[PDB]
Amino acid sequence: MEDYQAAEETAFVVDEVSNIVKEAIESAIGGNAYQHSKVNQWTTNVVEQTLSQLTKLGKPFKYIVTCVIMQKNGAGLHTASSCFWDSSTDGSCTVRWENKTMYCIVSAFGLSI
Amino acid sequence: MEDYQAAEETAFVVDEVSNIVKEAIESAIGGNAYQHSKVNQWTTNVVEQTLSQLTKLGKPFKYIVTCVIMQKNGAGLHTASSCFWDSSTDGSCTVRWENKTMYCIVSAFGLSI
């Protein structure tokens, strides 16, 4: 029982990362519409909140967070991520959020130290 | 002198990864115009070529490759990333490529094992 608890403590749980990413996106973006001059601040705030929460987790992981904001004007969006790590300890979580005007794709990667 | 060569061998060279990514983008994409049906193939080929070359480098790095391909239709693009590793060993390299019709941003992250 103790070993499973320790493994869960040291594991990269995708659900909590996705929750953190959703909370950061909503806090920084929320109901706000797409504005080109403010995409800089929005991406910065989302990534900073996500990395702060991931560090607050206390898990022995190096974290890499990437955020993409795109305007809804008919343009096509495709994000793909293929990597090379140890699948037993490192993880990734891609969260797609969208409102009436804007796509926000945030990919978080946690690699064991 | 030997220590410097060993460090350079084990270091995440930004320029080498940038050249690898540019080569992958040119090989997979080249001068082709934007086609939504080909974006999946282009992204997959770019990422796999980048990963293959980075693994052929022989450096003890876990590699993360993310590719974004979007049509040019007047919408402004921003891709942002902020992370948490040991800055002395792990590195990142983002390459922005564009033609008449499409933007393509590829971010590669090499983390020491």
SS3 B2: helix
A70 DSSP β-pair partners: A103
Rounded to whole angstroms, the Cα distance separating B112 from B61 reads 5
A53 in contact with B at a CB cutoff of 8 Å?
no
Strand order from edge to edge, sheet including B78-84: A91-98, A102-112, A61-71, B78-84
Q: Indicate the helix (H) or strand (E) that contains A55.
A: helix A39-56
CB contact under 8 A, B62 and A90: yes
Return the closest-CA partner of residue B17 out of B98, B93, B103, B97: B93
Query: Is there a contact between B77 and B102 (Cβ–Cβ < 8 Å)?
Result: no
Question: Can you say whether the dihedral through the CA atoms of A48, A51, A53, A55 is positive or negative?
Answer: negative
For this experimental structure, what is the resolution in angstroms? 3.5
Rounded to whole angstroms, the Cα distance separating B82 from A12 reads 19
Of B69, B73, B79, which has the smallest distance from its Cβ to A73's Cβ?
Answer: B73
Query: Is there a contact between A59 and B37 (Cβ–Cβ < 8 Å)?
Result: no
Question: Can you say whether the dihedral through the CA atoms of A95, A64, A30, A44 is positive or negative?
Answer: negative
Which tokens belong to A33? 């519409």
CB contact under 8 A, A81 and B69: no
Q: Which residue has the tokens 């690898």?
A: B20
CB contact under 8 A, B63 and A86: no
Rounded to whole angstroms, the Cα distance separating B37 from B16 reads 31
β strands within chain A, DSSP E: 61-71, 77-84, 91-98, 102-112
